Design an enzyme around this catalytic site. Structure first.
Site, PDB file in Angstrom:
ATOM      1  N   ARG B 151       0.820  -1.196   0.000  1.00 48.09           N
ATOM      2  CA  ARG B 151       0.000   0.000   0.000  1.00 48.09           C
ATOM      3  C   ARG B 151       0.854   1.247   0.000  1.00 48.09           C
ATOM      4  O   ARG B 151       0.430   2.244  -0.579  1.00 48.09           O
ATOM      5  CB  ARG B 151      -0.953   0.026   1.193  1.00 48.09           C
ATOM      6  CG  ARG B 151      -2.311  -0.562   0.893  1.00 48.09           C
ATOM      7  CD  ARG B 151      -2.918  -1.186   2.121  1.00 48.09           C
ATOM      8  NE  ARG B 151      -4.248  -1.721   1.864  1.00 48.09           N
ATOM      9  CZ  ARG B 151      -4.495  -2.907   1.327  1.00 48.09           C
ATOM     10  NH1 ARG B 151      -3.518  -3.720   0.969  1.00 48.09           N
ATOM     11  NH2 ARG B 151      -5.755  -3.288   1.148  1.00 48.09           N
ATOM     12  N   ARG B 255     -11.164  -8.593   0.730  1.00 46.59           N
ATOM     13  CA  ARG B 255     -12.278  -8.832  -0.184  1.00 46.59           C
ATOM     14  C   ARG B 255     -13.023 -10.110   0.169  1.00 46.59           C
ATOM     15  O   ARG B 255     -14.253 -10.119   0.249  1.00 46.59           O
ATOM     16  CB  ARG B 255     -11.767  -8.889  -1.621  1.00 46.59           C
ATOM     17  CG  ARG B 255     -12.830  -9.209  -2.650  1.00 46.59           C
ATOM     18  CD  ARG B 255     -12.212  -9.351  -4.028  1.00 46.59           C
ATOM     19  NE  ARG B 255     -13.169  -9.845  -5.010  1.00 46.59           N
ATOM     20  CZ  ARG B 255     -13.956  -9.078  -5.745  1.00 46.59           C
ATOM     21  NH1 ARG B 255     -13.913  -7.764  -5.652  1.00 46.59           N
ATOM     22  NH2 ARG B 255     -14.804  -9.645  -6.598  1.00 46.59           N
ATOM     23  N   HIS B 327      -6.844 -15.987 -15.897  1.00 47.57           N
ATOM     24  CA  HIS B 327      -8.122 -15.708 -15.249  1.00 47.57           C
ATOM     25  C   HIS B 327      -9.266 -16.335 -16.040  1.00 47.57           C
ATOM     26  O   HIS B 327      -9.310 -16.198 -17.267  1.00 47.57           O
ATOM     27  CB  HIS B 327      -8.326 -14.202 -15.117  1.00 47.57           C
ATOM     28  CG  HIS B 327      -9.534 -13.825 -14.320  1.00 47.57           C
ATOM     29  ND1 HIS B 327     -10.787 -13.701 -14.879  1.00 47.57           N
ATOM     30  CD2 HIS B 327      -9.679 -13.543 -13.004  1.00 47.57           C
ATOM     31  CE1 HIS B 327     -11.654 -13.359 -13.941  1.00 47.57           C
ATOM     32  NE2 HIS B 327     -11.006 -13.257 -12.795  1.00 47.57           N
ATOM     33  N   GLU B 357     -18.753 -20.388 -15.117  1.00 51.69           N
ATOM     34  CA  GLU B 357     -18.533 -19.788 -16.428  1.00 51.69           C
ATOM     35  C   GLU B 357     -19.451 -20.385 -17.484  1.00 51.69           C
ATOM     36  O   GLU B 357     -19.826 -19.693 -18.436  1.00 51.69           O
ATOM     37  CB  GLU B 357     -17.067 -19.922 -16.840  1.00 51.69           C
ATOM     38  CG  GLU B 357     -16.080 -19.275 -15.871  1.00 51.69           C
ATOM     39  CD  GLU B 357     -16.078 -17.755 -15.906  1.00 51.69           C
ATOM     40  OE1 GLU B 357     -16.647 -17.159 -16.844  1.00 51.69           O
ATOM     41  OE2 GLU B 357     -15.506 -17.148 -14.978  1.00 51.69           O
ATOM     42  N   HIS B 360     -22.475 -18.441 -17.145  1.00 53.28           N
ATOM     43  CA  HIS B 360     -22.294 -17.205 -17.910  1.00 53.28           C
ATOM     44  C   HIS B 360     -22.566 -17.427 -19.396  1.00 53.28           C
ATOM     45  O   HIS B 360     -23.220 -16.604 -20.050  1.00 53.28           O
ATOM     46  CB  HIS B 360     -20.867 -16.689 -17.749  1.00 53.28           C
ATOM     47  CG  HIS B 360     -20.633 -15.853 -16.534  1.00 53.28           C
ATOM     48  ND1 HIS B 360     -21.499 -14.865 -16.122  1.00 53.28           N
ATOM     49  CD2 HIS B 360     -19.599 -15.835 -15.661  1.00 53.28           C
ATOM     50  CE1 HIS B 360     -21.013 -14.283 -15.041  1.00 53.28           C
ATOM     51  NE2 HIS B 360     -19.863 -14.854 -14.740  1.00 53.28           N
ATOM     52  N   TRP B 459     -12.163   7.079   5.515  1.00 57.53           N
ATOM     53  CA  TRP B 459     -12.184   5.699   5.011  1.00 57.53           C
ATOM     54  C   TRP B 459     -11.943   4.674   6.099  1.00 57.53           C
ATOM     55  O   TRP B 459     -12.727   3.726   6.244  1.00 57.53           O
ATOM     56  CB  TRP B 459     -11.145   5.512   3.907  1.00 57.53           C
ATOM     57  CG  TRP B 459     -11.303   4.236   3.133  1.00 57.53           C
ATOM     58  CD1 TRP B 459     -12.326   3.904   2.302  1.00 57.53           C
ATOM     59  CD2 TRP B 459     -10.391   3.136   3.099  1.00 57.53           C
ATOM     60  NE1 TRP B 459     -12.119   2.661   1.760  1.00 57.53           N
ATOM     61  CE2 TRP B 459     -10.934   2.169   2.233  1.00 57.53           C
ATOM     62  CE3 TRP B 459      -9.169   2.874   3.720  1.00 57.53           C
ATOM     63  CZ2 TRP B 459     -10.301   0.960   1.974  1.00 57.53           C
ATOM     64  CZ3 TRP B 459      -8.543   1.673   3.462  1.00 57.53           C
ATOM     65  CH2 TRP B 459      -9.106   0.734   2.593  1.00 57.53           C
ATOM     66  N   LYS B 463     -14.326   1.908   7.673  1.00 58.67           N
ATOM     67  CA  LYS B 463     -13.951   0.499   7.788  1.00 58.67           C
ATOM     68  C   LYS B 463     -14.112  -0.013   9.214  1.00 58.67           C
ATOM     69  O   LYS B 463     -14.564  -1.144   9.422  1.00 58.67           O
ATOM     70  CB  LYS B 463     -12.533   0.272   7.269  1.00 58.67           C
ATOM     71  CG  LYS B 463     -12.183  -1.201   7.176  1.00 58.67           C
ATOM     72  CD  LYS B 463     -10.790  -1.439   6.653  1.00 58.67           C
ATOM     73  CE  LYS B 463     -10.680  -1.208   5.165  1.00 58.67           C
ATOM     74  NZ  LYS B 463     -11.420  -2.248   4.402  1.00 58.67           N
ATOM     75  N   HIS B 487     -10.574  -3.545  -9.123  1.00 54.84           N
ATOM     76  CA  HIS B 487     -11.769  -2.944  -9.711  1.00 54.84           C
ATOM     77  C   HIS B 487     -11.760  -1.426  -9.608  1.00 54.84           C
ATOM     78  O   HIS B 487     -12.182  -0.734 -10.541  1.00 54.84           O
ATOM     79  CB  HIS B 487     -13.014  -3.519  -9.049  1.00 54.84           C
ATOM     80  CG  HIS B 487     -13.115  -5.004  -9.166  1.00 54.84           C
ATOM     81  ND1 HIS B 487     -12.530  -5.863  -8.263  1.00 54.84           N
ATOM     82  CD2 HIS B 487     -13.712  -5.784 -10.096  1.00 54.84           C
ATOM     83  CE1 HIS B 487     -12.775  -7.110  -8.623  1.00 54.84           C
ATOM     84  NE2 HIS B 487     -13.491  -7.089  -9.732  1.00 54.84           N
ATOM     85  N   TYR B 497     -21.256  -6.763  -7.023  1.00 49.83           N
ATOM     86  CA  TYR B 497     -21.023  -7.922  -6.170  1.00 49.83           C
ATOM     87  C   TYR B 497     -22.031  -7.998  -5.029  1.00 49.83           C
ATOM     88  O   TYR B 497     -22.495  -9.092  -4.690  1.00 49.83           O
ATOM     89  CB  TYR B 497     -19.586  -7.899  -5.666  1.00 49.83           C
ATOM     90  CG  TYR B 497     -18.617  -7.877  -6.819  1.00 49.83           C
ATOM     91  CD1 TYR B 497     -18.631  -8.895  -7.761  1.00 49.83           C
ATOM     92  CD2 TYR B 497     -17.721  -6.833  -6.990  1.00 49.83           C
ATOM     93  CE1 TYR B 497     -17.769  -8.890  -8.829  1.00 49.83           C
ATOM     94  CE2 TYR B 497     -16.849  -6.817  -8.062  1.00 49.83           C
ATOM     95  CZ  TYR B 497     -16.881  -7.851  -8.977  1.00 49.83           C
ATOM     96  OH  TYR B 497     -16.023  -7.858 -10.050  1.00 49.83           O
TER      97      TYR B 497
END
Ligand code: NAG
Ligand code: NAG
Ligand code: NAG
Ligand code: NAG
Ligand code: NAG
Ligand code: NAG
Ligand code: NAG
Lengths: 201, 596
Positions: B151, B255, B327, B357, B360, B459, B463, B487, B497
Site C-alpha cells: 500500500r 475482499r 483468469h 462460467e 455465464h 475511510w 472500515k 476494480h 457484487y
C-alpha cells in the site's frame, strides 16, 4: 425404355458460386428426366421441406417446367424460406407464395462460403418501401429514403444503402453460418408436361 | 415517415453493422488473450479503436432522434443505450488525459512489483507472489510487511492519479446530466417509463442500506467468531473488544475471508467434502469437467453447448511457448460464437468455476435472439448471479454424490453442514460489508461529501464502523489504500457484487421452490428439474429488453432486491454462531484497542 439425358441438377446444387439472396439465380429446367430420389436420399441436406407435394411421389409425377432458385442465406434465416413467413429475407429478398407447390432444400456451407478473414461477397437487401411479391427479384441499388429529406443519391442521415453484406467466418455459430438454399418450384401449365420422373423397367 | 420508424430503421442498420464490427473486436481480444504477443496487442488495439470510433459515429448519428417521441420500450432502450456520450462529451485534451490516466493505472496495478528494503535483488508481483503470502502465511510481521509495503508503493504512486481521476470523471458525469460519477454508476439500475416497475438512482443507496441493516447481525456474529479464532491463531495482537487487524484476513484487501477457513474451521476432526482426490483417482480431464457441467445444464432443461464452443475454446493451459491470461473468462464474441478461456486444473475450485462460467455462457446464449444493443444482463447483478447459482447448486453434496464424485456412504450430519455453511459465509457474507463500504466511500468521494484532505480519515472510520477492520498503523493522505484493488484502479463498478450476492440467494430460493426441494436451502440442487430451468430461461431469454425489476418478478415474484433468502440460507449457521458466541462479545469497538 432406357432413359438418358438427366436434368441438370449438378449445375444447380454443385455450383462453384451461388448468387446473393437479393439477386437469386433462377434456372428454368425443361425437357429432361428429373430424378428426385437422388436428392431426397442424400445425407448432405439439412432442410428438405416440401410444400404442396410429398417427396415420394415426385419421382412419379410429371411437370411442365421446374424453376430452380439458388441463393445463400444465414442459418437463422432458413425458416423464412417458407409460405407465409415474415422477416428480412421474406419481405425484402425472396418471397414464396402461400399457394406454393415445390420444395425448399437448404444445407450448411461453412466449408465453402466462409473464410478466416470473413466472406463479404454475399449481399442481402435490408430495406425496401414495400414487401416483395412472390417470385420477385429486386436488384435495384437506389438509396432507401427513411426520412422526409431527399437522399439525392448519397448515403447520409436517414438515407441508407439498401444492400448489406453478410459476414461469414468459419468460427460463427450455426445460426450465422452460410446455408446454400435451392428452391424448386413445380407448376403444371396447359402445354405438354415434359419434366417427368424416371420410369421403372 | 414517423420518428419512431426512422429510429427503428437506424437501429436495424446499427445492429447489422455493429454485430460484425463487435465480432472483429471480440475475436481480436480473444486472440490477444489466448496468445499474448505484441502483434496481437496491436491487432487488438486497432480493432478496439475501430469499434470505439464506430460507436462514437453512431452515437453522433443516434442523438438526432429525440427520445420522448418514441413509445416502444425496446426501441427506446436501444436508443438510450446508444445515445450516451460516454467520454465524448468531454474535451479532447481532458479525454486524452483520462485515457492516459486509466492506462497508466492499469500498468501500475499490473506491473507493480514490491519487495523488502535492503533485499532488492529479486521482487514479487501481486499475482502470485503476494497472493500466496497473504493467503497462506501465519506470521504477523511478514503479512504486515507485505500489506504496508504494497500500500506504500501502490498508494503513493496512485494518489495524485486518483485525485485527477475523480475530477475528470465527475466533469464527464456532470457533462452527461448526472450528479456525479457515482450517479452514473447507479444509472445502471435506473428504470424509467414502466408503470409500477420504475427504479430510481437514489433508491439504490436506500435499498443497499436497508438490506445491509439486516445483514449486520449475521456479520457481527461471524466477525466475533472469526475474531475469537484469530485470537487463538495470533495470541496477543487481537483484542476481545476491538476490530480485526487488516493484514490478517487471508486476502490482500479483505475482499474475501475464504482463506481463513483453515484457521476458523468449526469441526476439523470431521472430514471435508473435497472431491479433488476423487477426480485425480478417476483421471478427470478438464474436458470431462466441462462435459459434466454440460450434463448439469441439460438436466435442468437449458440448451447444450455449440460445436463451436468445443472447437474454439481453450479449456487447458496451452504450454510454455504460448502465453495466455490465467483468469477464467466466458466470452460472448458475437454471431453465435461462445467460448470459455480458463486454465482448468483438477480441483474443486476449477470444477465449480467451470459451472460458473458455463452459467455465464448459458446466460449469453439465451439472449442471442435479442437485438445487439440489448444483449446484456438486465442489470450488472444478474449476469454474475446466474453463474453463482450454478456454483451454489454444483457445490452441494447431493450433486457430488449424484455424479459419483463423492462416496455414497459419506455421512451428512449437522457438523459438516455447519462447516460448509461457514466456508460459504467466509466467501459470501464476509464480502458484503467490504463491498458496501467501498461503494459508499466511492459514492461519497464522487458526491463531494469527503474532501481530498480527509479521504483516509473517513475511510478507516468507515472500515472500523462498517467492516469492523482496523488499520495496523495510521495512514496519512500520501497513501491511496482503496486503489490497490483491481476494480477501483481500473474503473469498474463495485456494487455488482453486493447485488449479485443478494440476487444469488433470491434466485436460489425461487429455483428450489420450483424444483420442490423440501429441506434446507443449502442442501438444494436444481438438477433434473425442467420447471426450474424454464423459470430460469424465462428471465434468461429477456436479456436487457425488460427492466430488472420485471425480470426479478419473473423469477422470484418480487419487484426489488431482497435480503431474506440470504438469511434463510445461513440460518443453521446463524443459530450455531449465536450459540458459540455466549462467552465472547458480539460487536466491535471503533477505538484503537487491538493495535494502532
Ligand atoms: C453434389 O456434391 C455432392 C457432394 O460431393 C455429391 O455427393 C453429389 O453427387 C453432387 N451432385 C448432386 C447432383 O447432388
Ligand atoms: C500464437 O502466436 C504464435 C506467434 O505468432 C503463433 O506462431 C502460434 O501459431 C499462435 N498459436 C495459435 C494456437 O494460433
Ligand atoms: C417494439 O419493436 C419490436 C421490433 O423492433 C416489435 O417486435 C415489438 O412488438 C414492438 N413493441 C411494441 C409494444 O410495439
Ligand atoms: C451528448 O453530447 C451532446 C453535445 O454536448 C449533447 O448535445 C447531447 O445532448 C448529449 N447526449 C446526452 C444523452 O446527454
Ligand atoms: C446437443 O443436443 C442436441 C439435442 O439433444 C444433440 O443433437 C447434439 O448432438 C448435442 N450437441 C453435442 C455437441 O453433443
Ligand atoms: C448435531 O445434533 C446433535 C443431536 O441433536 C446435537 O447434540 C449437536 O449439538 C448438533 N451439532 C451442532 C453443531 O449443532
Ligand atoms: C438426474 O438425471 C440423471 C439421468 O437420468 C440421473 O443419472 C441422475 O441420478 C439424476 N439426478 C438425481 C439427483 O436423481
Amino acid at each position: 425404355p432406357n432413359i438418358t439425358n438427366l436434368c441438370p441438377f449438378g449445375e444447380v446444387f454443385n455450383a462453384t458460386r451461388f448468387a446473393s439472396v437479393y439477386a437469386w439465380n433462377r434456372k428454368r429446367i425443361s425437357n429432361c428426366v428429373a430424378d428426385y430420389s437422388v436428392l431426397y436420399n442424400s445425407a448432405s441436406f439439412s432442410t428438405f421441406k416440401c410444400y404442396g407435394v410429398s417427396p415420394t411421389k415426385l419421382n412419379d409425377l410429371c411437370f411442365t417446367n421446374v424453376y430452380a432458385d439458388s441463393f445463400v442465406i444465414r442459418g437463422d434465416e432458413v425458416r423464412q424460406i417458407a409460405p407465409g413467413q415474415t422477416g428480412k429475407i421474406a419481405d425484402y429478398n425472396y418471397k414464396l407464395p402461400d399457394d406454393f407447390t415445390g420444395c425448399v432444400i437448404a444445407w450448411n456451407s461453412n466449408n465453402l462460403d466462409s473464410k478466416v478473414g470473413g466472406n463479404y461477397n454475399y449481399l442481402y437487401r435490408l430495406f425496401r418501401k414495400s414487401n416483395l411479391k412472390p417470385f420477385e427479384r429486386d436488384i435495384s441499388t437506389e438509396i432507401y429514403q427513411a426520412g422526409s429529406t431527399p437522399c439525392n443519391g448519397v448515403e447520409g442521415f436517414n438515407c441508407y444503402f439498401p444492400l448489406q453484406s453478410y459476414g461469414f467466418q468459419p468460427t460463427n455459430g450455426v445460426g450465422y453460418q452460410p446455408y446454400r438454399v435451392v428452391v424448386l418450384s413445380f407448376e403444371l401449365l396447359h402445354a405438354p408436361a415434359t419434366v417427368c420422373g424416371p420410369k421403372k423397367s | 415517415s414517423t420518428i419512431e420508424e426512422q429510429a427503428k430503421t437506424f437501429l436495424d442498420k446499427f445492429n447489422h453493422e455493429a454485430e460484425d464490427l463487435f465480432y472483429q473486436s471480440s475475436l481480436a481480444s480473444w486472440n490477444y488473450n489466448t496468445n499474448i504477443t505484441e502483434e496481437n496487442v496491436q491487432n487488438m488495439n486497432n480493432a478496439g479503436d475501430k469499434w470505439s470510433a464506430f460507436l462514437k459515429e453512431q452515437s453522433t448519428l443516434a442523438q438526432m432522434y429525440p427520445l420522448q417521441e418514441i413509445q416502444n420500450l425496446t426501441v427506446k432502450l436501444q436508443l438510450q443505450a446508444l445515445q450516451q456520450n460516454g467520454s465524448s462529451v468531454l474535451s479532447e485534451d481532458k479525454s486524452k488525459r483520462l485515457n492516459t490516466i486509466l492506462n497508466t493505472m492499469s500498468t501500475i496495478y499490473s506491473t507493480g512489483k514490491v519487495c523488502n528494503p535492503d533485499n532488492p535483488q529479486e521482487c514479487l508481483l501481486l499475482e502470485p507472489g503476494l497472493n500466496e503470502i497473504m493467503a497462506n502465511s501465519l506470521d504477523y510481521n511478514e503479512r504486515l510487511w507485505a500489506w504496508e509495503s504494497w500500500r506504500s508503493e501502490v498508494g503513493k504512486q496512485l494518489r495524485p492519479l486518483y485525485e485527477e481521476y475523480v475530477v475528470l470523471k465527475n466533469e464527464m458525469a456532470r457533462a452527461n446530466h448526472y450528479e456525479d460519477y457515482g450517479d452514473y454508476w447507479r444509472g445502471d439500475y435506473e428504470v424509467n417509463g414502466v408503470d409500477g416497475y420504475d427504479y430510481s438512482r437514489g433508491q439504490l443507496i436506500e435499498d443497499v442500506e436497508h438490506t445491509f441493516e439486516e445483514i449486520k447481525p449475521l456479520y457481527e456474529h461471524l466477525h466475533a467468531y472469526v475474531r475469537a479464532k484469530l485470537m487463538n491463531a495470533y495470541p496477543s495482537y487481537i483484542s476481545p473488544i476491538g476490530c480485526l487487524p487488516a493484514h490478517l484476513l487471508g486476502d490482500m484487501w479483505g475482499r474475501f475471508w475464504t482463506n481463513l477457513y483453515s484457521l476458523t474451521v468449526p469441526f476439523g476432526q470431521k472430514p471435508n467434502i473435497d472431491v479433488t482426490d476423487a477426480m485425480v483417482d478417476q483421471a478427470w480431464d478438464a474436458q470431462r469437467i466441462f462435459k459434466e457441467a454440460e450434463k448439469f445444464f441439460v438436466s435442468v432443461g437449458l440448451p447444450n453447448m455449440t460445436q463451436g464452443f468445443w472447437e474454439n475454446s481453450m479449456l487447458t493451459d496451452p504450454g510454455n511457448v504460448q502465453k495466455a491470461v490465467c483468469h477464467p473468462t466466458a466470452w460472448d464474441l458475437g454471431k453465435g460464437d461462445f467460448r470459455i478461456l480458463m486454465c482448468t486444473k483438477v480441483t474443486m475450485d476449477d470444477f465449480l468455476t467451470a459451472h460458473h462460467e458455463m452459467g455465464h455462457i448459458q446466460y449469453d446464449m439465451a439472449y442471442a435472439a435479442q437485438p445487439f444493443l440489448l444483449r446484456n444482463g438486465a442489470n450488472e447483478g444478474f449476469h454474475e448471479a446466474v453463474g453463482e447459482i450454478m456454483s451454489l447448486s454444483a457445490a452441494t453434496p447431493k450433486h457430488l454424490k449424484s455424479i459419483g464424485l463423492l462416496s455414497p456412504d459419506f455421512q451428512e450430519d449437522n457438523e459438516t453442514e455447519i462447516n460448509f455453511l461457514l466456508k460459504q459465509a467466509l466467501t459470501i457474507v464476509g464480502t458484503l460489508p467490504f463491498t458496501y463500504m467501498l461503494e459508499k466511500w466511492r459514492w461519497m468521494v464522487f458526491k463531494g461529501e469527503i474532501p481530498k484532505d480527509q479521504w483516509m480519515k473517513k475511510w478507516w472510520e468507515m472500515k472500523r464502523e462498517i467492516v469492523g477492520v482496523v488499520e495496523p498503523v495510521p495512514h496519512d493522505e500520501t497513501y491511496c489504500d482503496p486503489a490497490s484493488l483491481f476494480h477501483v484502479s481500473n474503473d469498474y463498478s463495485f456494487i455488482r457484487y453486493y447485488t449479485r450476492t443478494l440476487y444469488q440467494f433470491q434466485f436460489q430460493e425461487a429455483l428450489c421452490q420450483a424444483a420442490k426441494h423440501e429441506g434446507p436451502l443449502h442442501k438444494c440442487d436444481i438438477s433434473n428439474s425442467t420447471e426450474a430451468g424454464q423459470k430460469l430461461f424465462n428471465m434468461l431469454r429477456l436479456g436487457k429488453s425488460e427492466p430488472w425489476t420485471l425480470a426479478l418478478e419473473n423469477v422470484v415474484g418480487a419487484k426489488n432486491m431482497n435480503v431474506r433468502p440470504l438469511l434463510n440460507y445461513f440460518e443453521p449457521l446463524f443459530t450455531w454462531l449465536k450459540d458459540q458466541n455466549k462467552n465472547s462479545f458480539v460487536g466491535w469497538s471503533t477505538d484503537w484497542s487491538p493495535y494502532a
